[PDB]
Amino acid sequence: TDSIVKASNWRLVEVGRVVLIKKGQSAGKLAAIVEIIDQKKVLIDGPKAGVPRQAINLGQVVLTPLTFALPRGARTATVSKKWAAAAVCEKWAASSWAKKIAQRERRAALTDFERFQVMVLRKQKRYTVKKALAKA
Amino acid sequence: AESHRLYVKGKHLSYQRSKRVNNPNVSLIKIEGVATPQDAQFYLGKRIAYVYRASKEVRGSKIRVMWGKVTRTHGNSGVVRATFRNNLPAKTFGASVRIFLYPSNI
Amino acid sequence: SHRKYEAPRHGHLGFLPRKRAASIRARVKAFPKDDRSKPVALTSFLGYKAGMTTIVRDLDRPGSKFHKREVVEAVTVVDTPPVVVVGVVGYVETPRGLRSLTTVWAEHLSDEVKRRFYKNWYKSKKKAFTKYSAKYAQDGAGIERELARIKKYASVVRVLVHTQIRKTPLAQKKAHLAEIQLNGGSISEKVDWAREHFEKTVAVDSVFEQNEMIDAIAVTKGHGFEGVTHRWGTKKLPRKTHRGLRKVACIGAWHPAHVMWSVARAGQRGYHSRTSINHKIYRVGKGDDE
Amino acid sequence: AHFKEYQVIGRRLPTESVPEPKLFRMRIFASNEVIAKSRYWYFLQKLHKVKKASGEIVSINQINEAHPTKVKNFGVWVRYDSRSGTHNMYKEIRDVSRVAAVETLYQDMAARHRARFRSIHILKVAEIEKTADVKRQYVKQFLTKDLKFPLPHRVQKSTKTFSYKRPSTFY
Amino acid sequence: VEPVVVIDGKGHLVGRLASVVAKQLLNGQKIVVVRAEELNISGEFFRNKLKYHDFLRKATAFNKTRGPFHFRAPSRIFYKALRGMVSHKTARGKAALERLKVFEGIPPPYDKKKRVVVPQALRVLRLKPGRKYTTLGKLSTSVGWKYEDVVAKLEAKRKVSSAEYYAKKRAFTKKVASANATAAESDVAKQLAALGY
Amino acid sequence: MKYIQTEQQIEVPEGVTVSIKSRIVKVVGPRGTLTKNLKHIDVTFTKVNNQLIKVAVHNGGRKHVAALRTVKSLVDNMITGVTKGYKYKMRYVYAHFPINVNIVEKDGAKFIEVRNFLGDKKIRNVPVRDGVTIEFSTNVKDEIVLSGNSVEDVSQNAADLQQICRVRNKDIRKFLDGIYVSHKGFITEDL
RNA sequence: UUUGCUCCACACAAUAUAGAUGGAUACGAAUAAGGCGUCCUUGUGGCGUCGCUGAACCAUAGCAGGCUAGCAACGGUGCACUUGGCGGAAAGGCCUUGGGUGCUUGCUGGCGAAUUGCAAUGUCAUUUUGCGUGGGGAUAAAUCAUUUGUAUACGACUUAGA
RNA sequence: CAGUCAAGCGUUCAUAGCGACAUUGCUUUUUGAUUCUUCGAUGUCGGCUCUUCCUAUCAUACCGAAGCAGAAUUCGGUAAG
RNA sequence: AACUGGCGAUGCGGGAUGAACCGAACGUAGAGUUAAGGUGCCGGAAUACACGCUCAUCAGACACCACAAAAGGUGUUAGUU
C-alpha cells in the first residue's frame, strides 16, 4: 500500500512565476517574476502587460497559478519574447480569476440605463428558472 | 418598488474636538460605503439633514429638521466635516443622518 | 506597628454575614450528586426537632480504650411523620444554571399544604389550585403533557413534598413545603416515580436507615442583637474601662480610614441557616407501636 | 528621505602661496544636497586639517545606479558607535541599487544594534555579482540553483470591518 | 450599517475584537457577540491565568462587596475588555454599552441568523504562526466558571442541528443548478453575460 | 536568520505504509496501528517514491528548524514501533528488602503493584498503558519486562515505575533501592 | 367597593423614539488547509473545479406604486384560514399538506398624474387613556388591628383566628 | 538586609558550609541630615484590645544539596495557607 | 553663589494628573494652517506603509518624571578575531 500523503503543493514563488500587481501604479496587471531578491522582495517585469521592471515586495503582488520557462535575470526584451510564446497573457484571460475581475469592472461601468436593463433581464431569467424547478 | 431612498446613509459621530475641548459648531459625519478620503470628496458640499421627531406638531409636522453641508473631509478613513444651520444636539452621537445627492455634479 | 503577640482571629469569616436567615426553613443548598445506576430514591426528608435525651450503647472500636465498653451519648430526637409527595419540578441545565422549566402538581392538596399559600387563611375563599385541579381527571388531555415536557427536557427533577404538621403537637398547623431531588435511575423514571407517588406519603424508614451518616439543615436558635463579647468571642476589656468593657477596644487602624468588614461588631446572633454534616442514624423508630 | 548617492568634491580655500589645492572627493549617501555637503565637511574634518569655513565645495553631483533593475550582492563595511564603544563590521545585502542597500543598511543597523544615523559611518559599499565572494549565509541561501519557495499562510487584508466567511490562508 | 451585527467570537482576539466592537457601539451599531468561550487571547494559558489572578487580588480592603467584581464567565471577560474601551460612566457610554450583548454559545434568537467575523481581530490572520495563545473557555473555567461542560453539550447540539440545515441547503441549491442547466442556453442569460451578469 | 528551506527525509520500510492528513500521521504495520496528532509545529509532508517522505520547514527561525528534526524523529519511533516495537526491562535494586512486584487486575485495569519497597507498608500502584504488555522474564531474577508499540507509553510506564520508587528522607547515594530501567531496545531487532 | 378586572379586534392618544427609511442573507471544522462536483475498495481515498473578498446574493419598474384591458404560463409572492410537525440555552420562532383570495413587470396595450409652481424630512413602521366601541372570559387577596414566641430594640419574623 | 570576585578556611578540597582584600546594590522595621506641611493646637511613651497587610520563613506541606551511611542538624527552593 | 530664561504676576495646547517642563503668551468672533504632542478603543487623527528585533511561570511601552546596578545565560540576533 502506498504511503498516502496529502499532496499539499501550492504556488511557489520562482523565476518565471507570473504575478498580479494589486497596489501601485500597475494595480491589476500581470508581470513575470524575473529574479528573486529576498524572502519578501523580488524583481518583476510586465513589459507586454505594461509593468516596468522594478523591485517590489511580495506583499505588493499576488502570485498566480500560471508560469512559464523564463531564464533567470532576463531583461525586458527576453521576458516579452518568452511571455508571448507562452501565451501566458492569453491563459490568464481564459482563467476564471480574470473573468471575475473583468466581470467586476464591466458591472461597475454599467450606466443607470444598463442597470435597468439588467433588472428586466434578471426578472425574465428568474421567471423561467423558477418555473423550471417547479415542473422538475 | 419598496425602496425609495435618494440620500446616502450617514452617522453623526462627534463634534470636532481635541482630547478635552470640543467645538460644537462642526460635526464629524460618517458616510456609509466610504472608507477613504478620495471617495469622500464626491460628497463635499452636499446637503445633510438630521431628521428627528417631536411630540408637538409645530407647522403641520411632528418631524423637525436641521440642515447642513459637508464642508470638507476628515482624517484618512472617509469621515467628513459638516456644519449645520444649528449645531447638532450631541445626544445624536451615533444617530443617523441623511446625505443628499444635491447640489449635484454628475 | 505589628500586634505585640499573635492570636487567631475571633470567629469564622466564611459564615458571614451573621444575619437573620431569609426563612425559618433551611433549604438544601446542594443535593447529592446524581448516580444513574442507583434506583430512584429521595435524597432528603423533613422532620421536626423535638428535643434531646441520652442513650447507652456498647462501643465497637477495635483499638480504643473504650472498645467493647459501654458509653453514654447525647442524642437528638427528630419527630418525623411521613411527608406527602405533592408536585414535581423539572430543571433544565443551562449556561446560566438550573432553570425551573415547569412544575407539575398533584390532583388534590390537603388543608395543611394549601395553608402555606395563604397569609390570612381564615378569612379567604380557599381558592388555591382549584382551577388548576380542573386540568386533571382525563386520560392525557393536559395531564401527561407537562410530565413529558419534564421528560424530554429537565436534566434535574425534584419532587415537591410537605410535612404533616397536624400529626405533630405544634400549634403551627401549616405545612412546610420543600423540594426533594430524586437522584436515582434515569430521568423518565424520576418523573414516573414522582407521578406514582403523587399524593401519597413517604416514610422515613424508606429514606434513612440505621448506622448512616446524614446531614441536617436547620436555622439556628435566635438570640437577637448581641454585643461582640458573646457574638464573636472577643476578650472582655479590664474592669476599670471607662464607658464599657464588653467591646472591641480598637476597631481598626487609622488607615485604611474605614472600619473593615473583618472586625467584630455588635449584631444579630443566631438564626442562621446551617448545614451540619456527619450525623449517625442511631435509631429509626415507628410511631405505631410502644 | 530616500538616500541618494552624492559625489562631493571640495578643497581648502585657495591662498596666495597655495593656489589650486588638492581637491578631495567623497561619495556620501544622504537624503538631500544640504545633508550631503554637511556630511562631507564632517568627514573631511576627520581626515584633514580643514573645516567648512576654511574650505569650499567645488562640485556636488548625483551618482545614479548603473542598472537599477539588476539585483546584486553588496558588500558593506561599516563602523559604528554602540553605548560602550566602537566596532567595525562587514554586512552584506541583496538589492538593485547602492542607495536602497544603504537604506537597508541603516534599517538593519538600527534594528540589530540600535545604531542611529549619527553613530554610523559607511566605510565602503562594494558590489559583487560573483559568488564565493559572498560570506554571509543569510545571503547565500538565495543563490542556490533553481530557487523556489512558497509564501505560506497568506493573510489577505480586509477593506471592511466585517466579512461573511472565515478567511482562507491558501496560496 | 445593519440593524444588528452578530459576530461569533471563535478564533478571535479579545482585545482587538473589544476595540472594534467598542468603536461600532459608539458609532451606533448594535452588536451581539456569540461563542465567547471560543475567543482567544495571545500568550500561553499560564500567562493569562496569572493575569486574572492578579486581577483577582484587587478588591476593596474594608469591604470586598464594593471592590472590583471579578466576573468569571467568558462573555463577561469580553464585556470587561470592551467596557474598558468605552466611557461607561457617561450617559453616552451607557447607551453604547446597551447596544451590546455577549453570549456563550449561540442562544436561540441567533443560531438561525448570520454570523460574521472581524479580520482585524481574527487569530489566524493576526498572530504570527507558532505563537502560543489562550482560549477563553479554558481560562474562565480555571478561575471559577462552571458552565464549560454545559455549553459544550449545547453547542454540540446546535452544531448537529445546524449541519442538517446546511445539508438541506445543499439539497435545495443543487436542484437549482441542475434545473438551471436545463433552462440554460437562454437568450436572457446570454444577454446578461454581455451586460456584466 | 530565517532559513528559507530545511528538509529531512524519512525512509519507510517496504511493509509499512504511512498516512498523513493535515498534521495527523497514522503508521500502520504488522504490529498494528500508531497515530499522532501533530498540529503544533506547522510543518509540511511530501511523498517521493513510496519509500521516502520529505518533511520540510519553510522560512523557519532557529526554533522552528529544531522542531522539524523532532517531528522527523518521532515518526521513526512509530515506524520502529510497528516494525519492531520498543522493549524496556527494569531491575529491582535493593540492599535488604526484596521488592515484590506483581500485576493486579482491578475491574480489568491491569495495575502494577509494588510491595515491600524498603520494608514499608505503603503499597505502590502504577496503572499500565493500553499498548504496553507486562512481562516477567525467567533466566534472570528481579527483572520486569514490558514491550509496546509506542516508545512513549513504554517509556512513560517505565518512568512511572521509577517515579514511585524514589527514596525519601534518606541519603539516596547510600539508599539506592528502586526499580531502574536497564535495557531500552526492540522486541525483534535484527530478527 | 355605583359596572370593577382579563384576552382580542377597532375610529381617535401624549414625558417619546441613544435614532426606521428594501433584506441581521444560519453548516461545521481546519488555516503548513479547505469548499463544491464526481468516481470507487460493506471506506477518512482518486480525479475535476472555486477562492485571491459582500464590488456578492436575494429583492428590486407600476399615484410611496393608481384605474383598467389582453397573451404562447399551470409558475412566483401577500393575506384572513387549514392539516401535520419541529424548536427549552433566552424555546415565543421555524418548516408545513390543503382550499379561498388578491397581486404579478413573464410578455403587450388604453387611461390618469401636471399648479407641492426651480429644493424645503415634505410627514408612509408603537407604549399608554377615556361615564371609548363589542366578541369573549374564569368573579381574589394582602395590610392594620387581635393572636402567637421556634422571633424580636423598633420595624422585621413564626403562628392562629368567620 | 542581599549580591559579584574568590586570597583563604574547610585533614591532602575556594564555592557542603563559609569567606578576607575589594566592589555592586536593596530597604526605610535604626538614627542622623533637612525644614516642605501643621504653632486662631493633627492629644505624645508604654501596655491592654482588635483587624488586616508584607516576607527578608521560626514552625507546619512538598522538595533540591551537603563535609546527608542511621538519628539530629545545616544550606537552599516553592511557599505568608 | 554665576549667567540666562522662567514661576511669583499667567491664562491657553501638550506632558493623564502637577507653579516652574515642552509649545505658545491672551480684546471679541469667523475661516484656513500649524506648534508641542499625538493618530487600536477610551479620544480628534493610518488596526498606514517599510526593514528588522523581542516571547518575559515579575515583557515592554517616550524627555523633565516619578529609579535600578555590579555580575551572569550555546535564550536568540548581528559582528570581530
SS3 for chain B is: CCCCCCCEEEEEEEEEECCCCEEEEEEEEEECCCCCHHHHHHHCCCEEEEEEECCCCCCCCCEEEEEEEEEEEECCCCEEEEEECCCCCCCCCCCEEEECCCCCCC
Cα–Cα distance measured from residue B25 to residue E44, given in angstroms and rounded to the nearest whole number: 49
CATH of the domain at F19: 3.90.930.12
Q: In terms of DSSP H, where are the helices of chain C?
A: 111-115, 143-152, 187-196, 228-232
Cell of C238: 479590664
Cα–Cα distance measured from residue F18 to residue F31, given in angstroms and rounded to the nearest whole number: 14
Shared domain check, F78 and F51: yes
Beta strands in D53-102 (DSSP E): 55-62, 72-81, 86-95
Shared domain check, F37 and F79: yes
Shared domain check, F78 and F111: no
Check if A78 contacts D (Cβ < 8 Å): no
Q: Which of A22, A97, A82, A91 lies closest to A58, judged by CA?
A: A22
For β-strands D4-12 and D24-30, DSSP reports them as antiparallel
Shared domain check, F186 and F94: yes
**DSSP β-bridge partners for residue D125:** D76
Work out the widest C-alpha separation in chain D, in whole angstroms: 83
Shared domain check, F44 and F62: yes
- Cell 419534564 -> residue: C150
Residue B26 has a CB neighbour count (10 Å cut-off) of 21
Sign for the pseudo-dihedral over CA of A17, A23, A25, A27: positive
**Minimum CA–C1' distance nucleotide for D110:** I52
Provide the 8-state DSSP code for C257.
S
Q: In terms of DSSP H, where are the helices of C143-269?
A: 143-152, 187-196, 228-232
Burial of F76 (0-12, 13-18, 19+ CB in 10 A): middle
Cell of C15: 459564615
Cell of A73: 535575470
The two counts, helices (H) then strands (E), for chain E are 8, 5
Residue C162 has a CB neighbour count (10 Å cut-off) of 23
> Which method was it determined by?
cryo-EM
Cell of E157: 447540539
Beta strands in chain F (DSSP E): 3-11, 17-20, 24-29, 32-37, 44-47, 52-60, 86-93, 100-104, 111-115, 124-127, 132-135, 143-148, 178-186
Q: How far is D171 from chain A (nearest CA, A)?
A: 6
Assign F5 to helix, strand or coil: strand
Shared domain check, F58 and F108: no
Q: How far is D102 from chain A (nearest CA, A)?
A: 15
Cα–Cα distance measured from residue C123 to residue A98, given in angstroms and rounded to the nearest whole number: 87
Domain boundary among F85, F112, F137: F85
CA C269 to chain centre: 19
Sequence-ordered list of residues with C-beta below 8 angstroms from that of D44, at least 6 positions apart, any chain? D10, D24, D26, D50, D55
DSSP secondary structure letters along F36-79: EE-TTS--EEEE-SSSEEEEEEEEE-HHHHHHHHHHHHHHHHHH
DSSP secondary structure letters along E140-195: HHHTT---HHHHHHHHHHHHHHHHHHHHHHHHHHHHHHHHHHHS-S-HHHHHHHHT
Total count of domains within chain F: 2
Cα–Cα distance measured from residue D148 to residue E94, given in angstroms and rounded to the nearest whole number: 56
- Cell 522527523 -> residue: F72
Shared domain check, F175 and F106: yes
Domain boundary among F56, F85, F114: F85
Sequence-ordered list of residues with C-beta below 8 angstroms from that of E9, at least 6 positions apart, any chain? E17, E33, E34, E35, E36, E37, E38, E39, E78, E136
Distances in whole angstroms, Cα of residue E4 to Cα of each of A43, C215, C282, F190: 47, 51, 64, 69
Q: Is the CB of C128 under 7 A from strand G?
A: yes
Shared domain check, F61 and F38: yes
Residue of C92, C99, C260 for testing the chain E interface, max E β-carbons within 10 Å: C260
Sheet holding F100-104, edge to edge: F100-104, F111-115, F124-127
Sign for the pseudo-dihedral over CA of D105, D111, D114, D117: positive
Check if A101 contacts E (Cβ < 8 Å): no
Residue B31 has a CB neighbour count (10 Å cut-off) of 23
Contacts of F42 in chain E (CB under 8 A): 129-130
Distances in whole angstroms, Cα of residue E122 to Cα of each of A72, C75, D68, E39, E111: 39, 65, 40, 9, 20
Q: Which of A25, A66, A71, A16 lies closest to A44, judged by CA?
A: A16
- Give the residue on E whose Cα is nearest the Cα of B96: E28
Q: Is the CB of A125 under 7 A from strand G?
A: no
For β-strands A61-67 and A51-57, DSSP reports them as unpaired
CA angle (F164, F165, F169) in 5-degree steps: 105
Which amino acid makes up residue D45?
Q
Shared domain check, F179 and F96: yes
Shared domain check, F190 and F150: yes
Q: How far is B70 from chain E (nearest CA, A)?
A: 18
Shared domain check, F174 and F96: yes
Alpha-carbon dihedral angle through residues E55, E57, E60, E66, given to the nearest 10 degrees? 50
Residues in chain A: 136
Find and give the residue nearest to H46, measured CA to C1'. Answer: C4
DSSP secondary structure letters along A69-111: ---TT--HHHHHHHHHHHTHHHHHHHSHHHHHHHHHHHHHT--
Alpha-carbon dihedral angle through residues D139, D140, D143, D149, given to the nearest 10 degrees? -70
CA C182 to chain centre: 16
3-state SS, A7-67, equals: CCCCCCEECCEEEEECCCCCCCEEEEEEEECCCCEEEEEECCCCEEEEEEEHHHEEEEEEE
Residue C152 has a CB neighbour count (10 Å cut-off) of 10
For β-strands B8-17 and A61-67, DSSP reports them as unpaired
Spatial distance from the CA of A55 to the C1' of I76 (Å): 30
CA D1 to chain centre: 12
Cell of E44: 500561553
Spatial distance from the CA of D165 to the C1' of I40 (Å): 23
- Residues 237-276 of chain C in contact with strand H via CB under 7 angstroms: 237-238, 248-253, 260, 262-264
Cα–Cα distance measured from residue C160 to residue C178, given in angstroms and rounded to the nearest whole number: 6
**DSSP β-bridge partners for residue C274:** C218
**DSSP β-bridge partners for residue D57:** D10
For β-strands B63-74 and A51-57, DSSP reports them as unpaired
Shared domain check, F180 and F104: yes
CA angle (C24, C25, C30) in 5-degree steps: 135
Contacts of D142 in chain A (CB under 8 A): 36-38
Beta strands in D13-70 (DSSP E): 24-30, 55-62
CA angle (C250, C253, C259) in 5-degree steps: 80
Residue C203 has φ and ψ, to the nearest 5°, of -90, 155
Q: Which of F151, F144, F135, F145 lies closest to F31, judged by CA?
A: F151
Cell of C163: 410535612
Which amino acid makes up residue C112?
E
Do B74 and B14 touch, CB atoms closer than 8 A?
A: no
Cα–Cα distance measured from residue F42 to residue F64, given in angstroms and rounded to the nearest whole number: 9
Domain boundary among F35, F58, F85: F85
> What domain range includes position F29?
1-85
Residues in chain C: 290
Which amino acid makes up residue C270?
G
